[PDB]
Amino acid sequence: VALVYGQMNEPPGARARVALTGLTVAEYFRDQEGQDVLLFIDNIFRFTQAGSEVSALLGRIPSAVGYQPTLATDMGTMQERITTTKKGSITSVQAIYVPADDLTDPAPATTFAHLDATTVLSRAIAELGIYPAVDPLDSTSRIMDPNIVGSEHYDVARGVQKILQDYKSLQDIIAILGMDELSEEDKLTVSRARKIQRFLSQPFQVAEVFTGHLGKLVPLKETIKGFQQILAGEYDHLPEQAFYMVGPIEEAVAKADKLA
Amino acid sequence: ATLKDITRRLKSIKNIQKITKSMKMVAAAKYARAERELKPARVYGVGSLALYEKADIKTPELIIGVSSDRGLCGAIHSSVAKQMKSEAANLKEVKIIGVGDKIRSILHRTHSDQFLVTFKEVGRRPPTFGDASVIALELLNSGYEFDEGSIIFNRFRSVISYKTEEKPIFSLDTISSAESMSIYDDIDADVLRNYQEYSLANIIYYSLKESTTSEQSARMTAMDNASKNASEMIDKLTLTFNRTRQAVITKELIEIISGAAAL
Amino acid sequence: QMSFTFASPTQVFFNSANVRQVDVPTQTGAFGILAAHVPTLQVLRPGLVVVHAEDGTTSKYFVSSGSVTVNADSSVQLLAEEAVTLDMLDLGAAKANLEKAQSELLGAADEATRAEIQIRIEANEALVKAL
Q1: Cα atoms in the 13 Å half-sphere on the side-chain side of B92
Q2: Is B52 in CB contact (< 8 Å) with chain C?
Q3: What CATH number is attached to the domain comprising B182?
Q4: Residues C36, C19: one domain?
Q5: Which residue of C has its CA nearest to B195?
Q6: Backbone φ, ψ for residue B99 (5° rounding)
Q7: Which residues contact C131 (CB under 8 A, 6 or more apart)?
Q8: Using CB atoms, which chains have 3+ pairs under 8 A with C?
């Protein structure tokens, strides 16, 4: 990683440009060495704000909500340099701050014009111990189209979510009226869902110096199969905790063994 | 449309939605249990009624309304009350009894000087034969030598429907001494006294067991809707809040610019 | 063929079942309703119910009280405030219970009070029979 910094004490113009500087660097590992670089802009809102400060200083009339008249171009001239050219591609993970919790606020609204996916980190999920604490129902992607990820991928994914949704429904019932008017059917959606929820968690190699556990980098193929089978009913006999913090389904099997 | 007021409203609706979703689930639980215990009750209650339909009973020549104490169950009470006033009018002497405080508060004032008794503690805990026996006893121990009475309650049909119905109380030990009753012989004039008393408790019990099933399914339904309306209201006020929030800033800023440019 | 219905507020045992005969405890003896019996009405008494099913080896039940009805049509309905199979009754208790009752009676002068005790005695006593 190369780190580029635009600290909060820097004047508008500096916090304004540092995301371009970082961009410059990344474009090299693509236009000069044709790799697949990763660009991280933390956070995309302070980019926009820096834009407004600069704008105001240049005495230009603000537009709706006080932002810059050039909000959309200031953003476009930067966002657009982030793509897959014939030489390689830059992929950007942008930390978003939504003002006033207003998703139609000009800053945020403009920004979604460019996003192809959202990764929603959730404190609730974390509380399940589940990590990464990504929310499987709130996180989204433009490319989740069978015409793009292929029917299999697309169906598994849509399978995982519905089940996760259904279980969500039952969640209310379980706690109140108690876990049993539950059908041979309603009891399976839960079981699997709970297995799934866990199978969606995973050990990171970045946290090895700490979790005393080995990181896993599951492959896409392994991912779709994994969930495919749980949906399928291939491991309904396996127990929940067999799936907590593992990589490929094979590990779910072996953990079960060590868990008698 | 003040960010203050909007916020005040959101505050009270988020709580309503919360308390209202809670009330729904509690009800659906009470309902579930009630729907089941109702299976046997019907057969039992329909059995009690098996004598009179299977063989005529009229009357030569007491309105009991059943519901509960708790509201927020759509039109459970208003229905029985509505039909209760209807009878008292069309009619022969008039005397009434209401089981469940709500009846005593609704088809009331107009007809207080037309009361005999009233019952409380109905609906929270599931009804029992025991409660029915108290109602029956309380009546037999009353100075009302009723010749004919009717019992008005809500007959369950499904979670989304019920029907206010009436059942005749020919309990008149006197009326059960008509021609049609000549078919059944070897009946002491006072064996009936026991028979009628009993069938009186059975009919009150039945109505009671039908009532809570209708009530818990209607409160469940009413609270489902209320909760869903709340959430929708929540979603709208929030969006109204952001539109307003953005316009105030824009509005306040254009005002500053106008003043500054004029100089 | 007679349609026999037997139930309590809480449980239902028979619903329009074609039974060949039933024995029920009444205030005046123990009437035996047959597939074809003359219409009648009677109040129950702590005792026993015997249901001669379509196929021999009859089933037994215990009743505390209630009513029984036989109509013009071959329809019969037995309704007990409480009706249980002997399978769930502890004889040991009943005894302990008949004792206490007969004791309270010996200490009661109040006509009404006595009645309430007398009735209890009768019931608990009737418990010995099939137990």
Answers
A1: 15
A2: no
A3: 3.40.1380.10
A4: yes
A5: C43
A6: -100, 115
A7: C86, C89, C91, C94
A8: B
